[PDB]
């Protein structure tokens, strides 16, 4: 029981590393999303005054 409880952290360590770095980088690169979102809002405002 000790053997098959321990025998899990062999091929999952790389998955944990890659998921950690990917999730952290995706969370912290939200600056691009914020810039695109504000550009979209301002373009929408310009189009809005256009149809107004």
């Amino acid at each position: 029981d000790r053997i098959d409880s321990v025998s899990q952290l062999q091929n999952v360590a790389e998955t944990t590393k890659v998921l950690f770095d990917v999730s952290k980088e995706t969370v912290e690169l939200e600056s691009e999303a914020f810039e695109l979102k504000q550009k979209v809002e301002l373009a929408h405002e310009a189009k809005a005054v256009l149809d107004s």
Binding site: E28, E30, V49, S52
Partner: protein
């Protein structure tokens, strides 16, 4: 006939000094020559948002922050919480 010239001169005299040419107003007392391009210039402006959406305020929002260069302190805090969560497994 009579109408063929009367109504054309009717719709070519008053509309001429009513708009387009934009000078004077003969048929009715209230003038729309200074009403539609000057008073109504702020019409949609009043209807819409003024000084915020019509001017498209260049709101430079604060850039996305981060862990503020957090040292190894948060690393061993994460180590401690992971250890105390996994101790009862």
């Amino acid at each position: 006939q009579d109408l063929y010239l009367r109504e054309l001169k009717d719709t070519k005299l008053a509309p001429s000094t009513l708009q387009d040419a934009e000078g004077n107003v003969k048929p009715w007392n209230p003038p729309q020559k200074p009403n539609l391009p000057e008073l109504e210039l702020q019409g949609p402006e009043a209807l819409k948002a003024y000084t915020e959406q019509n001017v498209e305020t260049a709101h430079v929002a604060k850039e996305s922050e981060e862990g503020e260069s957090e040292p190894i302190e948060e690393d061993w805090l994460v180590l401690d919480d992971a250890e105390e969560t996994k101790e009862s497994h």
